[PDB]
Design a protein around this ligand. Structure first.
Ligand SMILES: CCc1ccccc1CO
Ligand SMILES: CCc1ccccc1CO
Lengths: 158, 158
């Protein structure tokens, strides 16, 4: 009786932080969706420090503390995902965390660039993936945050 | 007598792999520099598998096996570093590896974009750093592979 109850936590990785509203609209939608399932979002800007190294450490700790990462690997400033998000995906991988990724553009990299090379003749990966192969771990690449969250609910029960 | 001798190993993270020569010129220069100090480069394309997941796994293993990562965080396809490299930096951070980074462009992000926002009104970080703050861990951002390697030699002796 009155056993400790673990509340599931998801690290919310993605470039929404760079939206004009600092991600407020995205994070509010995430908060509402997760609240209904008693899941807590771990949001990069929560209780935000002022020093870069402190912000980084807190975010790494959030990844250490999470049950899963849902990472927004949508195009950011071109066809490539956000590198901060990519760092967080790598951190989670090394820690053997469940990593779920989504993108607004699921086309293969060569489809996105329209060629096997970019405008500067740099090679575009040819592995039938939407982004750098390091970011793919065998789990399906989802279309949306919501679809990734549905996978979480099915595969990480309370 | 005849004790085991550890050979130092550095994971060579960076978008050189996307050069037309698949990084041959960069990697050859790296090989020559490291050879002189009895350091072994762990190069992403070494004994390259055909399947994305196998390539990724081998690269993660190289990071697990390394003494340090030297990561090329130079602009790739714009002002942002390569996301594969960023993933690898994240992996290394979580594994408490020595991470050394360099870039061909050390200007602050806001200097690079010329503004506190990009062309789409997305926020450019203002922390006096050349790239996404997750990629900075307190170690100096170097100007070149060689300068990062000199730091390695000074701070990771045999
Ligand atoms: C200010 C940008 C920010 C905020 C929270 C966590 C990470 C970052 C940059 O990666
Ligand atoms: C084929 C490109 C490549 C090769 C080795 C390791 C990683 C990658 C892409 O991230």
């Amino acid at each position: 009786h009155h056993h400790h109850h673990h509340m599931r936590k998801i690290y919310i990785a993605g470039p929404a932080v760079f939206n004009p509203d600092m991600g407020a609209s995205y994070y509010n939608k995430v908060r509402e969706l997760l609240k209904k399932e008693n899941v807590m979002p771990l949001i990069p800007t929560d209780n935000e420090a002022t020093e870069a190294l402190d912000i980084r450490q807190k975010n790494i700790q959030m990844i250490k503390d999470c049950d899963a990462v849902i990472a927004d690997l949508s195009p950011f400033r071109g066809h490539e995902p956000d590198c901060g998000t990519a760092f967080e995906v790598g951190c989670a991988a090394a820690l053997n965390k469940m990593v779920l990724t989504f993108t607004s553009d699921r086309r293969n990299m060569r489809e996105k660039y329209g060629s096997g090379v970019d405008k500067d003749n740099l090679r575009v990966e040819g592995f039938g993936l939407p982004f750098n192969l390091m970011l793919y771990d065998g789990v399906e690449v989802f279309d949306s945050f919501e679809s990734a969250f549905k996978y979480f609910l099915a595969n990480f029960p309370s």
